[PDB]
Design a protein around this ligand. Structure first.
Ligand code: HEM
Ligand SMILES: Nc1ccccc1C(=O)C[C@H](N)C(=O)O
Length: 370
């Protein structure tokens, strides 16, 4: 069904918090990364784990939790305290089950958005709503890392986007039914929800401190693709013989922007030399069912062409409201990357800026006007 929820969208609805007692040894380490890292006992605990079979993970929610658990342990093992003391070999007894589970779930054996954000959360009270005050994350890395604020605000933007995502079938049906008003309603509804998502994005400032993000959390989200600290990638002991590179790119692995890029025929899949290659690569790091969803949307008739073919200024204005909301979102995201990467980096990206500025202006160049 593309694993897309009416309420939470690309987020994993109501994730599992507990594994079977079989996996308690995994569970304990993941639940205690702040103390084990700080006290310098983490790597020993990982290095003294026994081989635990994944055959006792009986369903998707259990596999997603195990993947989040092993991904957090792996990031902590590789990066340690976060200050250059690195491990380049992931011990056999983590690496083999982590890589087996990853293959089953068709995701790379590294921490991704779909683990640390889409699966990493709970309601404090199951009867209060999906708001920040009623929610928590399941795992953090270090005390003060602001992982609660970063993951939960990302999740809440994701949940806000769900309201626009569930309208997408109405769009294609209305094109196909030849239902002009239904299509116009739907596009205005999508834009309205995307605007609401932009409002939710503002909570980022209330809960994430630029020093903590840039200097702590960013470290544990860092990968080994093009990383000088791990120039040949990571050795997954006992599974592949030579090291492999995978990006640690959690923020950029949301499907939300690409979801509406593709819906509105904005051309970034194919296009820019280095911008389109980056956007296509980050798809490798999305759950397969979401990869599938983005592809099926590309195969559908073009909404942008349909609107263009109609000589209908009302349609063109609803379409442009969607494109505007997507520009607003990337423009605000530009501001945040300035606040949370660029300024702290200088207090010690021009390629990073150019990538984001490019995707925004390509989105901006898509407005119809006429
Ligand atoms: C909170 C919700 C967020 C969402 C939904 C989101 C979404 C995205 C998306 C879709 C991209 C791909 C570029 C594009 O499509 O325009 C991207 C890139 C990026 N975002 Fe975010 N983002 C969020 C928050 C953040 C935050 C708080 C930071 C803090 C610095 C950040 C840092 C980055 C970086 C560095 C990139 C470039 C890819 C990379 O090098 O990792 N993002 N983001
Ligand atoms: N801060 C942590 C550090 C390490 C492991 C878990 C956490 C949590 O966030 C626990 C959360 N209160 C929960 O409801 O599971």
């Amino acid at each position: 069904a593309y694993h897309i929820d009416e309420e939470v969208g690309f987020a994993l609805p109501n994730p599992q918090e507990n594994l079977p007692d079989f996996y308690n040894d995994w569970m304990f380490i993941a639940k205690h990364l702040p103390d084990l890292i700080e006290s310098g006992q983490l790597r020993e605990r990982v290095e003294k784990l026994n081989m635990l079979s994944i055959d006792h993970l009986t369903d998707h929610k259990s596999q997603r939790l195990a993947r989040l658990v092993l991904g957090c342990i792996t990031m902590a093992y590789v990066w340690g305290k976060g200050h250059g003391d690195v491990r380049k070999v992931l011990p056999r007894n983590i690496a083999v089950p982590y890589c087996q589970l990853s293959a089953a779930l068709e995701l790379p054996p590294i921490l991704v958005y779909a683990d640390c954000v889409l699966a990493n959360w709970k309601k404090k009270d199951p009867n209060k709503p999906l708001t920040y005050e009623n929610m928590d994350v399941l795992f953090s890395f270090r005390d003060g890392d602001c992982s609660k604020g970063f993951f939960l605000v990302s999740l809440l933007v994701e949940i806000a986007a769900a309201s626009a995502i569930k309208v997408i079938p109405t769009v294609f049906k209305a094109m196909q039914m030849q239902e002009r008003d239904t299509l116009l309603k739907a596009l205005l509804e999508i834009a309205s929800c995307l605007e609401k998502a932009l409002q939710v994005f503002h909570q980022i400032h209330d809960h994430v401190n630029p020093k903590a993000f840039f200097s702590v959390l960013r470290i544990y989200l860092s990968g080994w693709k093009g990383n000088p600290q791990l120039s040949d990638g990571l050795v997954y002991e006992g599974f592949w013989e030579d090291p492999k590179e995978f990006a640690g790119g959690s923020a950029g692995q949301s499907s939300v922007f690409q979801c509406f890029d593709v819906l509105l025929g904005i051309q970034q899949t194919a296009g820019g030399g280095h911008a389109a290659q980056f956007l296509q690569d980050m798809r490798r790091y999305m759950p397969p069912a979401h990869r599938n969803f983005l592809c099926s949307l590309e195969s559908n008739p073009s909404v942008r062409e349909f609107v263009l073919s109609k000589g209908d200024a009302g349609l063109r204005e609803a379409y442009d409201a969607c494109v505007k909301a997507l520009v607003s979102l990337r423009s605000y995201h530009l501001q945040i990357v300035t606040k949370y990467i660029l300024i702290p980096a200088s207090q010690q990206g021009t390629d990073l800026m150019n990538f984001l500025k490019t995707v925004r202006s390509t989105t901006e160049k898509s407005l119809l006007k006429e």
